[model samples]
Target chain A: LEVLFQGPNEFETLELEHLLWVNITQVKHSIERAWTRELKSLNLSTEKFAILHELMCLGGESTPHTLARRIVFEPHSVSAIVSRMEKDGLIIKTKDLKKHMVRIKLSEKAIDTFYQALEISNRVYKQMMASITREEKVELSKTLTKLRNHTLPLTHKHTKTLTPFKYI
Target chain B: LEVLFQGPNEFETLELEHLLWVNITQVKHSIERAWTRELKSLNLSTEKFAILHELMCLGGESTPHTLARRIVFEPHSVSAIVSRMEKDGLIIKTKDLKKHMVRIKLSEKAIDTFYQALEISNRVYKQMMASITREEKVELSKTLTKLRNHTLPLTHKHTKTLTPFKYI
Candidate 1:
């Protein structure tokens, strides 16, 4: 099952960095692919999933701004999605009369279905991890945790400097 | 340095899948933040950087479809990006006389600037890997490769079944 593609020159020889980048992005796409398929089966989209997740993570309440930061999405994009979710009755916006701020709350339906949604998420992970062993996953997670810690702090400094189009 | 936030309910407890997912996404965002900042300093976008890399990787000439497949971008997205790159004078198109296949070629400007673009890429990777060892990176690469190989095939079957909105 081992195969190597030989391209004519060194340029065609893949750099380790690029290979790592490719693998990460590809695995990300695969996770998105499988999970979204599950989400769609229940009429859920990623935006909805994010909102539910944030609310649940914060014990059923969060501000849109904090949610944006938590989920690594643009505040404006999260705002639009929030509005849609509000309209759809998947969530509610409670006015903070004391502070003039807004708090987002998941509706009863979301609270009821959160476990179902999580089941789908867990299902995809189980499928992906099927052939991978517990020991291997533990090792993989350790590496990922270290890489994430190294890169996360480096990222925050320049993130606010981005123009609108540059966001993924 | 160790801290864990306990959720109010058992359902709120973090799952291993969610932990891995979060780490992967955070790393992705970090890479985007650092690399885009570097690219913008040179007035280049990710799309432009990607096209240049693909061209250089192919030894300066490739078909649009092949390039799209290799980069794991949607064909239409690649076409649009390719069109923009063409109009910006970074690339050229050649028609195969016998087979009528259209191939993409990097322009002289791209040739002149390829290394410049690569320097920015290399810089970001180097920064991310600054404190990590060679052995750590090799281990990281192996885990990523395994994760990618595990999930990539699981994704292909259901990908085209997606509607446009499923993409993040």
Candidate 2:
């Protein structure tokens, strides 16, 4: 029922292409808003919570570099997130076997808050995705994965430190 | 074939909810990366181009506040984007008949660049959506709109400047 295409009097026909970006941005904004609301209810930062969630899965032993790659965050921001989590007592940093690097794990405080954290995180995400059928989910996932694969190689292109060219 | 459910040894069954957020974030990230790449190929900031596209639809004249809402951007940022586009010869701002405000209009340069702009924007968008069928796009849109609707009312629920309650 949501009409993305509209006739603009100035144009012969509406440009459907631009609406594609609009819708994509809308979906992203909605999901972000949902996350922001859900995370705030539990008094958690998305970045820190993402770190905790991933650390829990990886048995609470991971580095910022690996976490950054797995979570698709800027590597620089990951370091800052870990430091903030440490300061907040949600996580702790310890020396790794490799002397130059550190490994991170959730602290006792984080473990204590685990059940409530998952409850809050799980509820909002479920509510968000509940409307999509399994069939629709599969379709959406395939489309997104294909898009991701196509975009991955283009990330390092057009750096300011490097010359600019039309990579497309 | 996409499984968002995960189990860590410590939990009987890991809460699958959080991974839902992860996949959603991932999809958004991929599409954004693709857009960034395609827009860079044309040497256009996505921000500037978005404003142009919006103005074109609104009869080529609009105010910053309206532009911000239609484009889902912070109102504060639109002023700067409009200024930048003005400097780049893509748009012009004139005094609004209503005092203390201004209206924006596309310059000849932007109109001149229209065809190539759509060519690039349309191509990348179509490519990102190639695997999705018309029906899928509609369904996805409905699901997302529902998601957006669900989140919209909850926006200001937990602000420090506000209070906490499950509006849902």
Candidate 3:
């Protein structure tokens, strides 16, 4: 069903807001589906793949917080994800009882799965991105970086000052 | 209500898998919420925003199939989204007898909204990305491109083979 009728939702009226909403929403969701399907055969979700991906990138050990920061997720979420990974035996987390910090490392099975999943996922996305060029990639990164820097403070404050507006 | 307690989840038994699921879920969901909140004030859904965004990126015009390829969603969803946007007065489907193709352009209001939404949404995302440096931006983009290019074909295909994976 359609929404209850309303007058012209002109670009200013709601266009800008809707555009932002759509772009952000699309990027976040599509990535997940891609990640999920790539790892489906392994019974792994994309979040799980982050660990493998990070390990693949760094080619060595990383702590929970270290991995969390690189993965662009909240620390708590990363911890929780790591906890489950530990349970499944895909990774081993060791603690320095004296330092009160834990370190995460991949199990052999995880290392094995990461290689296979990465190669497959790599091929799949290459086709999806046939249209985008390297120049655009470079340009888009610059532009997006500009946007990110420009809006950070307001967004941070938005959490507090903009909470009520959330329902608006 | 939360899910019925499943026995020890992947995090507990397979730590890496847990991490992958967590990142994908959190990143995807957060992005989704951000967009929803951004557009809620405008009375727009992601679908509506999709049509608008396509117009802006593709020199302000698109056919449904053409636009659908930019994002990872069903063509049927595109059909539904387009139908709804047309009803909302945000778009016009050309009706010339010779123009059998479903071509579209944003309404005057859509044009206005597009300008503002780009400015504001870019602002929101830009600010949040303040800490990301040029190097980090490149890193993020590479991974994002890698994610999109590598996984789209598997998503398109029903089989498990990774033959079409294209990491551009």
Compute each candidate's TM-score over C-alphas. 0.81, 0.71, 0.47
* Residues A1-168 of candidate 3: C-alpha lDDT, one tens digit per residue: 666843222222333323333333444555556656656888777667655766555444677656755554456777888789889888788886558887778888888887687666655444444455655444444444344334433323333111000000
| Best model number under TM-score | 1
> Which predicted model would earn the best lDDT?
1
> Candidate 1, residues A1-168: lDDT per residue as tens digits?
655774345554454665566567766767776677777866676657766776786788877766776666556777988898789788889998758889888888877777688787777777776766667666666776677667766656433322111100
* Model 3 error, position B161 (Å): 21
Off by over 4 Å in 3: A1-168, B1-10, B13-18, B96-100, B157-168
DockQ of candidate 1 compared with the true complex: 0.30
Ranking, lDDT, top scorer first: 1, 2, 3
For model 1, give the TM-score of chain B: 0.78
Question: Per-residue error at B8 for model 1, in Å?
Answer: 5.0
Q: Which structure among the candidates has the greatest DockQ?
A: 1
Q: In order, what DockQ does each candidate have? A: 0.30, 0.22, 0.06
What would the TM-score be for candidate 2 when compared with the true structure? 0.71
